Amino acid sequence: ATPSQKYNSRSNRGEVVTSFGLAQGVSWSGRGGAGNISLKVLGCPEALTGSYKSMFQKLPDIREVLTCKIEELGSELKEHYKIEAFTPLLAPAQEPVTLLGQIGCDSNGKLNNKSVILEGDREHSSGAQIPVDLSELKEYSLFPGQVVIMEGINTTGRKLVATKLYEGVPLPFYQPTEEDADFEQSMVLVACGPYTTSDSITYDPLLDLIAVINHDRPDVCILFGPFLDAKHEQVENCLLTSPFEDIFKQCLRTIIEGTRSSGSHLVFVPSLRDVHHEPVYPQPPFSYSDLSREDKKQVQFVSEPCSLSINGVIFGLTSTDLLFHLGAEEISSSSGTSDRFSRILKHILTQRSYYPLYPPQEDMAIDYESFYVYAQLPVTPDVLIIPSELRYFVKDVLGCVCVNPGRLTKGQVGGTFARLYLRRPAADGAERQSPCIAVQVVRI
Amino acid sequence: VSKPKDCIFPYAFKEVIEKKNVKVEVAATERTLLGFFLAKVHKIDPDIIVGHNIYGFELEVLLQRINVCKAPHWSKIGRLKRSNMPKGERNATCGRMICDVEISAKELIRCKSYHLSE
């Protein structure tokens, strides 16, 4: 009877809630489909294309994974800080040692300054666990699963008193070929569901989006699931009179069509909350055939997460709330003045995975077999789009434009989306010339 | 036996010792005690050394508590005069065999644990 009432009576409409880069007017606009638009899917073997290989795991392999995880990073962290040799987490000694391991809590609760523990690697400490003493550590940022190199003293071999916590090391950023500097400015929109009010099935915001897509004629519109929110009240009590599979095609249409004039490439990103799709991270692309030869040049389906190249501009793509997770379980030495987020995100660029925090949020199934091949970062992203139930924002970090457009929708009220403007400048100088020149988070 | 740094032997000890006839030589500095050992060793001149948890705890402690207080002639623990000490174990007591009962115990018998206690 009322549905979306409050949503559509919104007055903040169009309001810019944050900017970044170089101030821009309100006249954001790209050339539509004009010129060359090079959308190349990147990562490890082309980031998965089919449904899967399975949905049955062999403990004997998850193990193998988690170990490589640590070994690999380690192997390279060891080459960077040039340490000479890690020490078994079980071998005692009076002199200071450099262990290798992954944090982890000692119980089922919230990791904390007391309960931290390090579980070494197989290759050196054949998986031994030794709790950690931090009293003697100045600056530290820890989270369960955090591959870490620590130096401290373990004399009894039943406790290590940390003395130093090496700083995480990220991957080099993408090396632009000469061709990528010859591309012109592009403007990427970006938005993530829910795409409807939690009290209606109107998808109103969806539409508003569309319109907005049109008006501004963006070059690329990367849209993050959930299209059909597994959590939307009506959906979980199965009151809908339509089959999920459909409903979803429905919206998929409205949007492909609703924006045929725009000339904007559409890049969809699946979500674990999309009731109709494979509840397994990493997820496979979406599935749809209803596409004219026309729309096939305009839409593209990609996994979750992903490393996509928008004009030699390496974007990072993940639908999972990696930030409201990592951040729910992280410990630090400072609270006075430090940027919680800028930190969590910092680990992300150094951990080299799209979800290092392990074990993973209580409701977020993962198949590590796949996770080893399809959820690693290729190179430090030039831009990172990390949606989240956490307030909007955009922080430059370790040379990466980390952007969280917030939710297009939030409960009964208006959300936001955001846009970026790109163009890789002149070849030489002090290297890092952020191809992402500006961005804006806007209500809708 | 020696003493820490914040502690002082109880009063009359030396004397209370001398009354119950006990070959308990009392040193003042860990550095004393250490040299003492290093000394006894040289003249007792063992060929084999039997301890517990020798290779996995003690043998090192010592070799460090020694270089820490720079005791006189660590090399004595050996039988080959040497200048600089490596941090490196099996080579420390070269010329002297080291029996580790923990090790030989396992290799020779089944038990719940291999802590001296059991």
From Swiss-Prot, chain A:
<keyword id="KW-0597">Phosphoprotein</keyword>
<comment type="subunit">
    <text>Component of the alpha DNA polymerase complex (also known as the alpha DNA polymerase-primase complex) consisting of four subunits: the catalytic subunit POLA1, the regulatory subunit POLA2, and primase complex subunits PRIM1 and PRIM2 respectively. Within the complex, POLA1 directly interacts with PRIM2/p58.</text>
</comment>
<keyword id="KW-0235">DNA replication</keyword>
<dbReference type="GO" id="GO:0003677">
    <property type="term" value="F:DNA binding"/>
</dbReference>
<dbReference type="GO" id="GO:0006269">
    <property type="term" value="P:DNA replication, synthesis of primer"/>
</dbReference>
<protein>
    <recommendedName>
        <fullName>DNA polymerase alpha subunit B</fullName>
    </recommendedName>
</protein>
<keyword id="KW-0539">Nucleus</keyword>
<dbReference type="GO" id="GO:0006260">
    <property type="term" value="P:DNA replication"/>
</dbReference>
<comment type="function">
    <text>Accessory subunit of the DNA polymerase alpha complex (also known as the alpha DNA polymerase-primase complex) which plays an essential role in the initiation of DNA synthesis. During the S phase of the cell cycle, the DNA polymerase alpha complex (composed of a catalytic subunit POLA1, an accessory subunit POLA2 and two primase subunits, the catalytic subunit PRIM1 and the regulatory subunit PRIM2) is recruited to DNA at the replicative forks via direct interactions with MCM10 and WDHD1.</text>
</comment>
<dbReference type="GO" id="GO:0005658">
    <property type="term" value="C:alpha DNA polymerase:primase complex"/>
</dbReference>
<dbReference type="GO" id="GO:0005829">
    <property type="term" value="C:cytosol"/>
</dbReference>
<dbReference type="GO" id="GO:0036064">
    <property type="term" value="C:ciliary basal body"/>
</dbReference>
<dbReference type="GO" id="GO:0006606">
    <property type="term" value="P:protein import into nucleus"/>
</dbReference>
<dbReference type="GO" id="GO:0006270">
    <property type="term" value="P:DNA replication initiation"/>
</dbReference>
<dbReference type="GO" id="GO:0005654">
    <property type="term" value="C:nucleoplasm"/>
</dbReference>
<comment type="similarity">
    <text>Belongs to the DNA polymerase alpha subunit B family.</text>
</comment>
<dbReference type="GO" id="GO:0043231">
    <property type="term" value="C:intracellular membrane-bounded organelle"/>
</dbReference>
Swiss-Prot record, chain B:
<protein>
    <recommendedName>
        <fullName>DNA polymerase alpha catalytic subunit</fullName>
    </recommendedName>
</protein>
<comment type="subunit">
    <text>Component of the alpha DNA polymerase complex (also known as the alpha DNA polymerase-primase complex) consisting of four subunits: the catalytic subunit POLA1, the regulatory subunit POLA2, and the primase complex subunits PRIM1 and PRIM2 respectively. Interacts with PARP1; this interaction functions as part of the control of replication fork progression. Interacts with MCM10 and WDHD1; these interactions recruit the polymerase alpha complex to the pre-replicative complex bound to DNA.</text>
</comment>
<comment type="subunit">
    <text>(Microbial infection) Interacts with SV40 Large T antigen; this interaction allows viral DNA replication.</text>
</comment>
<feature type="region of interest" description="DNA-binding">
    <location>
        <begin position="65"/>
        <end position="118"/>
    </location>
</feature>
<comment type="function">
    <text>Catalytic subunit of the DNA polymerase alpha complex (also known as the alpha DNA polymerase-primase complex) which plays an essential role in the initiation of DNA synthesis. During the S phase of the cell cycle, the DNA polymerase alpha complex (composed of a catalytic subunit POLA1, a regulatory subunit POLA2 and two primase subunits PRIM1 and PRIM2) is recruited to DNA at the replicative forks via direct interactions with MCM10 and WDHD1. The primase subunit of the polymerase alpha complex initiates DNA synthesis by oligomerising short RNA primers on both leading and lagging strands.</text>
</comment>
<comment type="similarity">
    <text>Belongs to the DNA polymerase type-B family.</text>
</comment>
